[PDB]
Amino acid sequence: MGGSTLFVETSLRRKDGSLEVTGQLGEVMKESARIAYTFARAFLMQHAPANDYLVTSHIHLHVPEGATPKDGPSAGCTIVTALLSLAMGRPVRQNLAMTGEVSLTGKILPVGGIKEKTIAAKRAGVTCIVLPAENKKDFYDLAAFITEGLEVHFVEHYREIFDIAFPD
Amino acid sequence: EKDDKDAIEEKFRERLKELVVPKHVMDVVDEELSKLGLLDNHSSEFNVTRNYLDWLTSIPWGKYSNENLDLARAQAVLEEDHYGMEDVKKRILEFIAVSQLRGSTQGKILCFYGPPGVGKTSIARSIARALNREYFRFSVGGMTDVAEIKGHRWTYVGAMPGKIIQCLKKTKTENPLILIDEVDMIGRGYQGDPSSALLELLDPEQNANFLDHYLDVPVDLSKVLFICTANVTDTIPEPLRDRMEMINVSGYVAQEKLAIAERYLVPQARALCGLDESKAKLSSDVLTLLIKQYCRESGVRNLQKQVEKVLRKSAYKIVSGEAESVEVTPENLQDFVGKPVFTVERMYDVTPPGVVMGLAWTAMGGSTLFVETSLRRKDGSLEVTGQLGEVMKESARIAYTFARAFLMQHAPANDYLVTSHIHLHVPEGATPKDGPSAGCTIVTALLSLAMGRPVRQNLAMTGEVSLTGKILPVGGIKEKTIAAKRAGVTCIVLPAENKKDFYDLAAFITEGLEVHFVEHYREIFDIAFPD
Amino acid sequence: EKDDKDAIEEKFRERLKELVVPKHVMDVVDEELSKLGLLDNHSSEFNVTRNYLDWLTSIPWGKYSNENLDLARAQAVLEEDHYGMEDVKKRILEFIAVSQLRGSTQGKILCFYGPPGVGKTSIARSIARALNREYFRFSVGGMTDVAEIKGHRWTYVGAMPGKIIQCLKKTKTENPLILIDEVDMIGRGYQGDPSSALLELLDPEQNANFLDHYLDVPVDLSKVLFICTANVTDTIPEPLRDRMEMINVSGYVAQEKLAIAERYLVPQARALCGLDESKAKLSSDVLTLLIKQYCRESGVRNLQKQVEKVLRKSAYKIVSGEAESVEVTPENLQDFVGKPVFTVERMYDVTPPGVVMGLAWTAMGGSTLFVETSLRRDKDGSLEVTGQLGEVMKESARIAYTFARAFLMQHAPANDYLVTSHIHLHVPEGATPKDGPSAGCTIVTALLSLAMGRPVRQNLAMTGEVSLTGKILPVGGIKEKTIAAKRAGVTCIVLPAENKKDFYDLAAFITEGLEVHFVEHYREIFDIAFPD
Ligand SMILES: Nc1ncnc2c1ncn2[C@@H]1O[C@H](COP(=O)(O)OP(=O)(O)O)[C@@H](O)[C@H]1O
Ligand SMILES: Nc1ncnc2c1ncn2[C@@H]1O[C@H](COP(=O)(O)OP(=O)(O)O)[C@@H](O)[C@H]1O
């Protein structure tokens, strides 16, 4: 029907530790989440080795149904951010939207439908969008109206998004 | 095949004359009718096409019966259909008031929970009768397939559309009253959670473009008054629980059931058998005795059967000339119903040490049970039983932890929960939410065992106990004390906050029960063991 | 063709003339028939229309089997058909009385449950004839198809109605007796559950107006007498069971079976064989012998076969001219069935230490079984359990074990045996989930027997759940238990005090020979099962 904005929620359900995934029960969603889950853990263990929140807990995760097969990967980093948000216990720098597939070592990967996704962002009135470096060409080539009044950063690795999304 | 194509087309136009389809459906209707002219009446597709067109045209598109309504008239309907349900009548008139104000259906949808046979479906029938509104009911209890809701595509052998589409068709209206019963007993579908389908139906904005697998036309569903029923509140999924305006339909006491019986049940049964009102004389005392010793249902359905049996037994005597006239007395009731079934009300009249009363609500409404403990012989450890949840265990863990520390405060020289391995038992059935409510009871149970004293005779209590000894408030106070009144337990201890619920109860419920409200557990010990 | 369209119409009317249709139905048929009178004959649509009209006109609307009921007359029919079943016969009398008082036909829903071979199916046949009502039998069974009842859409290619409409066509009354079989074993899966469909069949409200995919008109089924058959009541779907009127049918003991045999079984096998009493003869002792040592079930299902077998054997003998009359006696029965199959029934005629006798309710009927224990050798001891034990069983048995420990140490502190050692316990299968914890108290008796080195009191059968404190709690299926204890050679039985109601509701001769204890606490059982 067109480009849309989708919300990502993480919740605590309370050795062992697991992630429980809900929403569309497509396999591709599950594997992408697993990747995201493990990277988040990996990121945490080096950034804040003291904390073991994600390590020692069962976490429930939900994603809305409005996604094509390719959109599954597209929401990779968002999960990670949410997990780190739950772990650090702090919400993001306010009014920040984002779309990107994340490698297991954390490098960001290209996503489809930048044109349609940006429309929803402007519609929802977000201050900032951060996108993969390889998606750079598509945004500049869009219509005029959507460009002005949007802060954009291009990212290659999730380390970058961490600093942007969380100032300190 | 001569006049076959023309007549079929024309009769559909007659149907479309009254039930005019939306403006975007002209093309779909015309296309099907035109290609019907193309298909020979011998072809397989022709027969299927005729069904599809018949189903489509049969839907009352943009056609709705009139609604004349009044809030004061509704109360008269409510009063005459059922006795009691003071809170229930209040709750439903609120929605009627809100609906009258707006003159259209609310975004929020209505559901009722309570014991089976309480009259949840009866309320739905009464509301329809109150609104002068057409009624239909379809069940979602035990379903697992979304295709049950959306039907199947026409190529299926004996093609059958969505149930929602059916009920709209039969009612011949755009604004029917639909009862979606047993929403709680919904199945978690393997191919996809029917939660998605349910949320489509609940949201009026989403209902405007509802799609099925059969019609392939966006149904402009709105102003349909969805009414739902449930038994317990837990089994409903999280997105559906908060999306639903919820009403508690509580149980009844002896006097309450009797008035139901005298006004409704006896006339219903007399009418069903066509009996003479003089020849089948039924005393009020009999029904009280029947209630106390022949039934354990919070509802009226089990009671209704026993009542039917009474009148049924009488009918045989009358025809056969066994008995000239039937005079139902407690003395001769044995012939009509047989021997008393529950001469035992509550077991443990003398409550032994390590036993404490327990309260909660269940699927069947108000429930009673007991907590039990014993020994089994440097360290000490706890064994728990029942088919208990993980949360239940942790509640006990809290309870066990506190008990040790509490025993220290009262009697330091004791070491009973310290150097002893104890078995604990908790009966199951109760809702997970209200499950930790036996927490404090458990503490009393463990402590009772400590010095070897029985808890103060005929003593009942419930409520969640925290780490600091704080007594947390619990829901469904009406249900718990109903059971307590059944039990004939005189003293009840309850949480402080829930004092609001107790004073919200009607006069009958509150009769002769010395209740006290408490905030810390040390307060209950003051009652439980002053000596 | 033009005048022949007319000719077909009145052929449909004459089928409908004495079958007075409802008002809504009249309108539906008028629309369809006038359609049929214009549509060309060669068209397949015409055939579909005709087929739909065929079934609609074939339904006997406003036609009833006018029940020429007489209360004593009907009673005699029931007696001349079956033995026993006093409770059920009374219930049927009540139905007759109800219909008489109204002076018009009425339909009720009645369910029969119990062990197989109790004649519930045959009672069905007997009721139909007694009432002068058309009979039909149907079996939902394990099928998961809704369309079996609801049928298919009429306008769809190769349309067929459900069994409910099918049988209503052959039977020429609005109010037949329909038998529904194996309501307990209704399945669920791909297409759905028939329980959803038949919910419309066993609901008084939905009975007044019933809809199918075939005939597509609201019809009256509130006049239809629905009889359902099941084996155990627990597994029946909650909504259907709770709304349903439930009648318990019991099995039979020696005397009862014997009565059935002489009165009914033997004459029935003679009819099948074409034999007469003048050529084949059977004494009571023979059938007593045949009942004792050739059958095990509480029903008489096996017994019919054994009798059928003997008479069948005798038929051949008659023709051949080996002996011109056959009289079966304990002397010559060995020729007909061979040596006795079940010579012994108590697989422990004396019960050794740590064995108890329990009684259990099973789908096939009342069954005895034995619970056995074994030993497998400061530290804590253990219990290991075996059998097809559910989650319920595991929990209840732990409680048994817990009460065991405390009971013994409180009663006798010197005997540290049970607590300090490892015990195996085995509980035999066949016990239904609900009847499962009924042998709780026996389990506890088992352990204590094992503990002191005391064998149990001979010929003692028991049942009853035990709480942690040792409160004996009431149990179900008492009727079946007692019948089983009778055959099992039991002399003493021990029950819950709350169950005293159930015990005395039995006929006198059944309860006879058995000393009965009602108990409330376990200290009592302990004294009963160990006198000294
Ligand atoms: N308070 C009441 N007063 C009168 N009739 C009642 C009352 N509660 C229940 N009933 C009776 O209950 C019957 C059906 O109950 P139902 O709606 O099926 O209960 P539930 O929805 O709890 O299963 C009706 O025939 C109705 O007369
Ligand atoms: N009480 C009884 N009196 C006479 N015959 C009986 C009795 N109980 C069972 N029978 C006989 O048992 C036979 C088998 O019963 P059947 O109806 O097949 O069993 P079920 O009830 O399990 O369907 C029947 O032919 C019937 O005549």
Q: Assign 3-class secondary structure to C123-179.
A: HHHHHHHHHCCCEEEEECCCCCCCHHHHCCCCCCCCCCCCHHHHHHHHCCCCCCEEE
Cβ pair B140, B181 in contact under 8 A: yes
Residues 6 or more apart in contact with residue C171 via CB below 8 angstroms: C60, C134, C136
Contacts of B48 in chain C (CB under 8 A): 156-157
The answer to the question of whether C365 is labelled as a binding residue is: no
Contacts of B42 in chain C (CB under 8 A): 43-44
**Cα–Cα distance for residue pair C369/C346, rounded to 1 Å:** 9
Q: Is A153 helix (H, G, I), strand (E, B) or coil?
A: strand
**Are residues B42 and C44, on separate chains, in Cβ contact within 8 Å?**
yes
A112 φψ region: left (φ > 0), alpha (ψ -120 to 50), beta (else): beta
Sequential DSSP letters for B148-189? HHHB--TTSTT--B-HHHHHHHHHTSSS-EEEEE-STT----
Residue-wise over A97-130: b if at least 16 C-beta within 10 A, else e?
bbbbbbeeebebbebbbbeebbbebbeeebebbb
The H or E element spanning position A81 is helix A76-88
For chains B and C, CB pairs below 8 A equal 147
Query: From the CA atom positions of chain A, what is the Rg in Å?
Result: 16
**Are residues C213 and B44, on separate chains, in Cβ contact within 8 Å?**
no
Any atom of ligand 2 within 6 Å of the Cβ of C260: yes
Pocket test for ligand 2, best of C112, C258, C264 (most atoms within 8 A of CB): C264
Rounded (10°) angle between helices B266-273 and B301-320: 40
Q: In terms of DSSP H, where are the helices of C382-437?
A: 391-411, 417-420
* Interruptions in chain B after residues (C–N over 2.5 Å): 377
Q: Is C261 helix (H, G, I), strand (E, B) or coil?
A: helix
Main-chain dihedrals φ then ψ at residue B333, nearest 5 degrees = -70, -20
**Which tokens belong to B36?**
């019907």
Closest CA to C477 of C89, C182, C114, C183: C114
Cβ pair C435, C361 in contact under 8 A: yes
Ranges of beta strands (E only) in C89-134 are 109-113
**Which tokens belong to C466?**
């035990």
Catalytic residues of C: 438, 481
Any atom of ligand 1 within 6 Å of the Cβ of B477: no
**Are residues C45 and B4, on separate chains, in Cβ contact within 8 Å?**
yes
The H or E element spanning position C36 is helix C23-36
Tokens 């049918």: give the residue: C249
CA within 13 Å, CB half, B210: 25
Any atom of ligand 2 within 6 Å of the Cβ of C138: no
**Cα–Cα distance for residue pair C393/C408, rounded to 1 Å:** 22
Cβ pair B241, B233 in contact under 8 A: yes
Minimal C-alpha gap between B523 and chain C (Å): 27
Cβ pair B302, B342 in contact under 8 A: no
The answer to the question of whether B114 is labelled as a binding residue is: yes
B343 φψ region: left (φ > 0), alpha (ψ -120 to 50), beta (else): alpha
**Cα–Cα distance for residue pair C426/C446, rounded to 1 Å:** 10
Pocket test for ligand 1, best of B112, B122, B123, B253 (most atoms within 8 A of CB): B122
Minimal C-alpha gap between C233 and chain B (Å): 16
**Cα–Cα distance for residue pair B206/B186, rounded to 1 Å:** 21
Q: What's the Cα-to-Cα distance from C484 to each of C114, C232, C427, rounded to whole Å?
A: 14, 17, 18
The H or E element spanning position B121 is helix B120-130
Ranges of beta strands (E only) in B249-331 are 280-282, 326-328
Q: What's the Cα-to-Cα distance from B466 to each of B386, B399, C80, rounded to whole Å?
A: 22, 8, 70
Cβ pair A77, A101 in contact under 8 A: yes
Question: Catalytic site residue B480?
Answer: yes
**Cα–Cα distance for residue pair C165/C174, rounded to 1 Å:** 11
Q: What number of helices (H) and strands (E) belong to chain B?
A: 20, 16
* Option in B46, B312, B376 nearest C402 (CB): B376
Resolution (A): 4.1
Cβ pair C128, C226 in contact under 8 A: no
**Cα–Cα distance for residue pair C57/C19, rounded to 1 Å:** 8
Q: Whose CA is nearest to atom 2 of ligand 1?
A: B82
Sequential DSSP letters for B24-81? TSHHHHHHHHHHHHHS-TTSHHHHHHHHHHHHHHHS-TT--------HHHHHHHHHHH
Atom of ligand 2 lying closest to residue C121 CA: 17
The answer to the question of whether C119 is labelled as a binding residue is: yes
Tokens 């004349």: give the residue: B68
Cβ pair B493, B378 in contact under 8 A: no
* Count, residues in chain A: 168
Cβ pair C216, B58 in contact under 8 A: no
Closest CA to A107 of A43, A53, A166: A43
**Are residues C469 and B354, on separate chains, in Cβ contact within 8 Å?**
yes
Catalytic residue among B126, B298, B437, B448: B437
Please give the single-letter amino acid code of residue A8: V
